[PDB]
Design a protein around this ligand. Structure first.
Ligand code: 2O4
Length: 116
């Protein structure tokens, strides 16, 4: 509390991120930052004001950018909400997002209870 040590956040939270990365096929669109021109979705940043992806979250854990664990939870949820905002409900990314949210819910609960 209330600025947690970065090494403690990394040790506690990284397994929850790893759980997301282990999901195949579902994590694949989330593993790298979105590049709208290269992917042919040029309106992406117009709609998605705060992009987020698994590699960025990992980098933030690795580099001590979270002061407290709810900031990490908020970035994971930002990633999910961006995908549900941008994509149509029939798309792979939308359905994959929903699966990741299921996995994350299960993983994050006991970890947050342990951190305070
Ligand atoms: C597009 O669905 C898939 C599904 C599986 C795979 C791939 C792509 N690919 C491509 C992965 C790169 N393309 C995207 O990442 C992406 C593309 C269009 C829309 C969106 C994209 N992602 C962002 C997060 C979004 O919200 N909409 C690899 C094989 C597995």
């Amino acid at each position: 509390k209330k600025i947690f040590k970065p090494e403690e956040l990394r040790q506690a939270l990284m397994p929850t991120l790893e759980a997301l990365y282990r999901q195949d096929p579902e994590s694949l669109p989330f593993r790298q930052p979105v590049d709208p021109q290269l992917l042919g979705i040029p309106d992406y940043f117009d709609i998605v004001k705060n992009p987020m992806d698994l590699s960025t979250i990992k980098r933030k854990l690795d580099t001590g950018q979270y002061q407290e664990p709810w900031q990490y939870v908020d970035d994971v949820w930002l990633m999910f909400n961006n995908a549900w905002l941008y994509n149509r409900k029939t798309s792979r990314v939308y359905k994959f997002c929903s699966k990741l949210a299921e996995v994350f819910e299960q993983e994050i609960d006991p970890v947050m209870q342990s951190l305070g």
